[PDB]
């Protein structure tokens, strides 16, 4: 099996730049007719896959000006020209010149835009759960720059470390930016059993933890 | 246009089977060459198996022998006939078109899930999100909705029904001990809501759920 390392695992970059991607395959990968089946995929964010380049270097049609193949012999390189915000994704090379085909294992294009900060938010449990016993309480950080952030649940200021859900969109083409979500759940019995909830989070955009709470009250 | 639509994702159990189609339009299946590449909840993309303009045959290592695929050019499917499917089998499948001789992947559908696991099917409970106090006076305002405890992926939701999708963000859906946990908000203008109507849309297939919830202003 030929196998293809890419290289950046993660490539951050700001917009206007340009972006290199390499694929290093661990054998030659010429198909016995001769060609080069050598291709590169980019998939969207809750989209498939598609097309870019094929044969090493022929842009599908449809494709924008500034992406472009390159290389030969185990050495294999995308090149982007002027970073677009919807140019944001997973990268995949391929290799078809050798049975059983493979993929590299990707490389994620990540846009590098100013720092923003959070809009955070907190919701009690609604009443239909709390009728169920169950008690869920929930944090967005939306919209927020760079992506590394850190929350934390107090309960009547004591922190809770249990029963904590956290998930985060990819990166929005839209505005360049992260957002995240956070679930606390307990019991109602658990919930009810005291007063003051809130949601706690260090992010670079603030000297200060930002707090977003409520009382059961 | 040219266009593939994968159906048959379904939830199997571990040794089970599962037949997948895909039906081509806007193109002839005969000529170009066809396959199945899949990709893992880890996201890594990973070739199936393939069929030739002249029906030959490839597979891949970890598949050859329990799945089959096919053509129909009469009627443009193709199928891929899973067996003893196991838990790496577990992924979303995408059929794809090539321009034989040229290009492996140049046309791919939109995928169908497949899921190989004991778990059972559960059907989500979703709850509406009101704002608590303060962040509800304000020049905007963020709802939200809860969907808990299903199995298994996907779901699908939206609010009002999908006219309103400016704003939005639904949350990737994160699994603890066979059941799944999802979410979304939406922030729009303090004189959107709760002047008109907010409403989250909820459908999960596997477990047959189709459910809506309106936000509703809060506070006893």
């Avoid at chain 1, 809009?119 to 720059?145: D, H, K, M, R, W």
């Avoid at chain 2, 009469?74 to 995408?94: G, H, W």
Wanted: proline residues 5%; aromatic residues 10%; hydrophobic residues 30%.
């Amino acid at each position: 099996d030929v196998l293809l390392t890419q290289t950046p695992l993660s490539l951050p970059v700001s917009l206007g730049d340009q972006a290199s991607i390499s694929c290093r395959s661990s054998q030659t990968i010429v198909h016995t007719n001769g060609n080069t089946y050598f291709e590169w995929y980019l998939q969207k964010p809750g989209q498939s896959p598609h097309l870019l380049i094929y044969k090493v270097s022929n842009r599908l049609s449809g494709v924008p000006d500034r992406f472009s193949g390159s290389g030969s012999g185990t050495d294999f390189t995308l090149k982007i020209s002027r970073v677009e915000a919807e140019d944001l994704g997973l990268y995949y090379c391929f290799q078809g010149s050798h049975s059983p085909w493979t993929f590299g294992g990707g490389t994620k294009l990540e846009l590098k835009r100013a720092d923003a900060a959070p809009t955070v938010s907190i919701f009690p449990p609604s009443s239909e759960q709390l009728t169920s016993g169950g008690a869920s309480v929930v944090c967005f950080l939306n919209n927020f720059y760079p992506k590394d952030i850190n929350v934390k649940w107090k309960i009547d200021g004591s922190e809770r470390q249990n029963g904590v859900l956290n998930s985060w969109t990819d990166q929005d083409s839209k505005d360049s930016t992260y957002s995240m979500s956070s679930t606390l759940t307990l019991t109602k019995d658990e919930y009810e059993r005291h007063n003051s909830y809130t949601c706690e989070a260090t992010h670079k955009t603030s000297t200060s933890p930002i707090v977003k709470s409520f009382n059961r009250n | 246009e040219l266009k593939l639509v994968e159906t048959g994702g379904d939830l199997v159990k571990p040794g089970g089977s599962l037949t997948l189609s895909c039906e081509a339009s806007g193109f002839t299946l005969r000529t170009y060459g066809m396959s199945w590449v899949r990709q893992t909840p880890q996201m890594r993309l990973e070739w199936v198996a393939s069929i030739s303009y002249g029906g030959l045959l490839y597979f891949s290592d970890s598949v050859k022998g329990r799945f089959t695929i096919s053509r129909d050019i009469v009627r443009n499917i193709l199928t891929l006939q899973m067996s003893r499917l196991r838990s790496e089998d577990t992924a979303i499948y995408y059929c794809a078109r090539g321009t034989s001789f040229v290009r492996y992947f140049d046309v791919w559908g939109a995928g169908t899930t497949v899921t190989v696991s004991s778990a059972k099917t559960t059907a989500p409970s979703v709850y509406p999100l009101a704002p608590v106090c303060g962040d509800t006076t304000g020049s905007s305002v963020t709802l939200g909705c809860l969907v808990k405890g299903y199995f298994p992926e996907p779901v699908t939701l939206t609010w009002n029904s999908g006219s309103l999708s400016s704003g939005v963000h639904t949350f990737p859906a994160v699994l603890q001990s066979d059941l799944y946990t999802l979410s979304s908000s939406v922030t729009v203008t303090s004189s959107t809501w709760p002047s008109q109507s907010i409403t989250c849309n909820v459908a999960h297939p596997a477990s047959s759920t189709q459910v809506d919830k309106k936000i509703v202003p809060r506070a006893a």
